[PDB]
Amino acid sequence: RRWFHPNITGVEAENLLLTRGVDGSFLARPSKSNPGDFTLSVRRNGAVTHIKIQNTGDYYDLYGGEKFATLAELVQYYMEHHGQLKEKNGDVIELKYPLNCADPTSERWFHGHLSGKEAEKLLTEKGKHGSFLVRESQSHPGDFVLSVRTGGKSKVTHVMIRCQELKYDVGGGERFDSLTDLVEHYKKNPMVETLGTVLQLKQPLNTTRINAAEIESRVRELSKLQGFWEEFETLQQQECKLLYSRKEGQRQENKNKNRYKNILPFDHTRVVLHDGSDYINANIIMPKKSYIATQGCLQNTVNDFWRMVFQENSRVIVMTTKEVERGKSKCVKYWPDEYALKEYGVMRVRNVKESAAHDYTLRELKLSKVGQGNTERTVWQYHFRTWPDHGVPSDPGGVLDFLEEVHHKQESIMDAGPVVVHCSAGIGRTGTFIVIDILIDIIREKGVDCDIDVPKTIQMVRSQRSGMVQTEAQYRFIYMAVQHYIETL
Numbered sequence: 001r002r003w004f005h006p007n008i009t010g011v012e013a014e015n016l017l018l019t020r021g022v023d024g025s026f027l028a029r030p031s032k033s034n035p036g037d038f039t040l041s042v043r044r045n046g047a048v049t050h051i052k053i054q055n056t057g058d059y060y061d062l063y064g065g066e067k068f069a070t071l072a073e074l075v076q077y078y079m080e081h082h083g084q085l086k087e088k089n090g091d092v093i094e095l096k097y098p099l100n101c102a103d104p105t106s107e108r109w110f111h112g113h114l115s116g117k118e119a120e121k122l123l124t125e126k127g128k129h130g131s132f133l134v135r136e137s138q139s140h141p142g143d144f145v146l147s148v149r150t151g152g153k154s155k156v157t158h159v160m161i162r163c164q165e166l167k168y169d170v171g172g173g174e175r176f177d178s179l180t181d182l183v184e185h186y187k188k189n190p191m192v193e194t195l196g197t198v199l200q201l202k203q204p205l206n207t208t209r210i211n212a213a214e215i216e217s218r219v220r221e222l223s224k225l226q227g228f229w230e231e232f233e234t235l236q237q238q239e240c241k242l243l244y245s246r247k248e249g250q251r252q253e254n255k256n257k258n259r260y261k262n263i264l265p266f267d268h269t270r271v272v273l274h275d276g277s278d279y280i281n282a283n284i285i286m287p288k289k290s291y292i293a294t295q296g297c298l299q300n301t302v303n304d305f306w307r308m309v310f311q312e313n314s315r316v317i318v319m320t321t322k323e324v325e326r327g328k329s330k331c332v333k334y335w336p337d338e339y340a341l342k343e344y345g346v347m348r349v350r351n352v353k354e355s356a357a358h359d360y361t362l363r364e365l366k367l368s369k370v371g372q373g374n375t376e377r378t379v380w381q382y383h384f385r386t387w388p389d390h391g392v393p394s395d396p397g398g399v400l401d402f403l404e405e406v407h408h409k410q411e412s413i414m415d416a417g418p419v420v421v422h423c424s425a426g427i428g429r430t431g432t433f434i435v436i437d438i439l440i441d442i443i444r445e446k447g448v449d450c451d452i453d454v455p456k457t458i459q460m461v462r463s464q465r466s467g468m469v470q471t472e473a474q475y476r477f478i479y480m481a482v483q484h485y486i487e488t489l
């Protein structure tokens with residue numbers, strides 16, 4: 001996504017759409033003031049119309065429109081079929097020409113002030129055949145250096161990128177608009193030098209990996225001058241690669257089964273139901289223990305929800321939201337009252353005992369099917385209630401206490417299905433919950449001296465359900481959650 005400009009103000013996007021843009025030219029904007037606030041500035045009738053987007057933690061809220069999982073799915077929803085983005089006076093908005101950005105800040109291969117001695121050291125210890133990165137030049141203030149490793153017959157070559165009148169080149173041939181256009185060009189058409197060595201640009205140099213023991217020192221660098229914002233928005237510009245097909249949720253017979261019409265499961269990980277429709281807004285997740293990220297249950301999908309728990313042999317349910325938050329409704333009461341028995345379609349649930357903790361409340365439910373005798377299943381529902389309406393908790397210890405108890409219950413039950421996690425839309429809070437549980441389980445097995453990768457773990461999960469982990473505060477909270485886990489060991 002090149003229509004996203006991470007480091008501009010509201011006035012510049014106005015100037016840019018009025019100078020280098022025609023009608024239909026749009027542009028994405030993060031409001032520098034408030035993190036979690038974005039703007040969709042569209043040029044129309046010689047003026048720029050600013051459409052505000054707010055992400056409290058659960059979804060991207062378009063003002064006057066609908067709710068979307070990512071900003072890529074938002075732009076795709078309006079570009080691919082127009083006629084739904086209106087100024088609500090009746091006049092419609094058109095998204096036709098993405099204003100491309102030249103800022104390389106949030107690219108995998110960009111490192112900025114990274115010198116040449118550290119860059120040579122980094123590629124020697126972490127680079128493979130094809131690793132590369134781009135850095136600012138120290139000798140010539142303004143230029144850039146591309147260092148590539150190809151492989152003691154392993155080498156690290158250096159290609160000097162010169163900047164001439166806001167245009168970049170490698171010494172000869174074409175001159176490009178941005179560093180990205182230069183990198184994307186030689187990533188596809190490799191640079192061959194005199195003696196027949198191809199300078200292959202396979203994957204950028206990995207710097208996000210961490211030996212799990214020394215993570216507190218990485219949080220130090222990331223914390224202030226923002227390293228966390230630099231890493232998150234770098235992760236955010238890879239969401240345009242995860243636009244997999246969501247056709248099963250976009251059809252009429254399934255529209256009233258999604259709490260939010262434009263937050264839909266991927267077809268390749270959706271949980272299909274069998275005994276009867278097959279559709280539920282749910283996705284299987286796995287890096288052993290698996291997960292199922294569901295939405296807040298709608299009244300018309302409660303029976304489908306309990307069908308899924310039975311079919312996947314789930315024994316643990318993680319509720320990371322209240323029933324009513326911020327005015328609207330986010331989850332329907334899908335469990336019977338204490339000591340009560342209710343029938344949900346062919347399914348049957350008995351709430352035998354409720355246990356109130358400080359952060360959460362636990363419900364021991366008994367799930368059985370109508371007709372078949374002696375259907376066991378003790379489903380344990382963990383309802384987290386200390387999560388705030390806006391943002392993330394200020395202390396990771398509350399969730400970590402909640403999550404360690406859930407893991408022990410899962411391991412206690414011999415051969416248990418995936419752990420069901422759900423909030424409002426089932427992408428933000430649950431995305432933060434599932435990622436935290438994935439990272440801790442690695443440090444729970446291989447020990448303290450293992451290697452974790454928060455950005456790689458998130459995109460691995462983001463490939464199975466749209467927009468897992470929503471905000472930078474959720475991204476930062478994941479780091480704080482892992483750090484607090486090490487300090488207790």
Ligand SMILES: Cc1nc(N2CCC(C)(N)CC2)c(CO)nc1-c1cccc(Cl)c1Cl
Pocket residue numbers: 105107108109110111112204205206207208230231232234235238453455456457459
């Ligand atoms: C999010 C991220 N950020 C990086 N950087 C580069 C620019 C910086 C040094 N300024 C800040 C950190 C790097 C590089 O290893 N990888 C990632 C990543 C790691 C795993 C998966 C994915 Cl999908 C990404 Cl995108």
